[PDB]
Amino acid sequence: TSIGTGYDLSNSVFSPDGRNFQVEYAVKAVENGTTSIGIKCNDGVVFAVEKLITSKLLVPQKNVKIQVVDRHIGCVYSGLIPDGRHLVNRGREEAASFKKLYKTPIPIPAFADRLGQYVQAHTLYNSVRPFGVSTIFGGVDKNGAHLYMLEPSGSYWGYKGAATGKGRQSAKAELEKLVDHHPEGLSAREAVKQAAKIIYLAHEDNKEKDFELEISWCSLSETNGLHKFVKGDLLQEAIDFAQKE
Amino acid sequence: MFRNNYDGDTVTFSPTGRLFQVEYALEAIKQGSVTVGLRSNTHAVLVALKRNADELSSYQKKIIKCDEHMGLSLAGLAPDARVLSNYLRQQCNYSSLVFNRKLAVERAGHLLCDKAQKNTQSYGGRPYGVGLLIIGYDKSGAHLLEFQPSGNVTELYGTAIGARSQGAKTYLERTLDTFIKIDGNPDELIKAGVEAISQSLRDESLTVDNLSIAIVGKDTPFTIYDGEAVAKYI
């Protein structure tokens, strides 16, 4: 059963099949978010998102969609806005605390584990609902580049390429194809162009709406391991490469 | 029908993934009176239509100042408007006193957003049912933030929230290419806001008492006009 009446009206309850349903409904909520992707380069991670420009009133260059948890960790989610940015703030707090204590940037696996523990904690007690956002995050540390994606259930895995949101199936298929064609690892410059291609392919689901796409990437070599947005000539090059499709 | 079984509280998703109890809070804004805000690089303006309980009563305070550089206008629930306005004023005082620093509007928006979010997860509490427009001028330039009870804070050149806000918002979309360029004239900016709000009125046209305006910018600290002071703009 896809609904399981009775056992889904509260959090922290197992259904007869062993599933706890509120987490499943939270996963269903992730389906409604804007399509977002993250690609693990040979030496970095590239993030891209299809930010739908809802209205002309918004000032574009200041209402960002990608968030920096720490100067070396990039984070981007899809799902409920409140839960998403609250999780972003909490992860930023955790990274700042770790930097304050150990005087060094937090390694990505430790940050991912801390966020997984935080999110999973909300699936335990019935007074709180599970987070409704699937969060893609990653960066560069002493061990190289890591890309992660934690679900509303709290589960997370290391990904060579991840996608979340509404336009997720086509994006994930194209990302599987990309990883297949480049088993040796993509260069960050090529990865940005491929991410632009993938996002443009994902937009074909909702062509009727105008859109913009933010691209940000952290690479050990090209950006010294600091997360920066793509602007200027490189963004236009990635566009022109994507416009052929 | 099936919505009725899952909107009991803000701690339960519906099988479609929707969180009804906060969609209701966002719909609560539509009960409140229209308020309009618009921005130019030199000044930012708020325009609010005040409502009175009866002909023998004084009008509601739609516009609140939190500091000499920033203020806000709000629509929705009074009990939540009080809480959020008081919290933001307290935080402005905290920033100005403990840190000797004017609270940046961009920081203030997210600082209020974080408080707004927590109510949408814990049982017993309910989402705030008020949407408010933070307006101010700081070192980075003019600002105008439309805060929604879902915890969404967004930078807008101009916006309108409240009952029949669609007309004012459409007029703002149609004249964004113009009202931004005013850039220095406060009178003309307030006038443009006044046409914007005038599109949202079905009855009870603008009057010296029901209309209220605010402005802030490079040279003007947040100042509120009402009564005879706004007779020239009507």
Partner: peptide
């Protein structure tokens, strides 16, 4: 819940 976390936040 989150009130407990906020107390331990700093």
């Amino acid at each position: 819940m989150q009130a407990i976390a906020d107390s331990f936040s700093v």
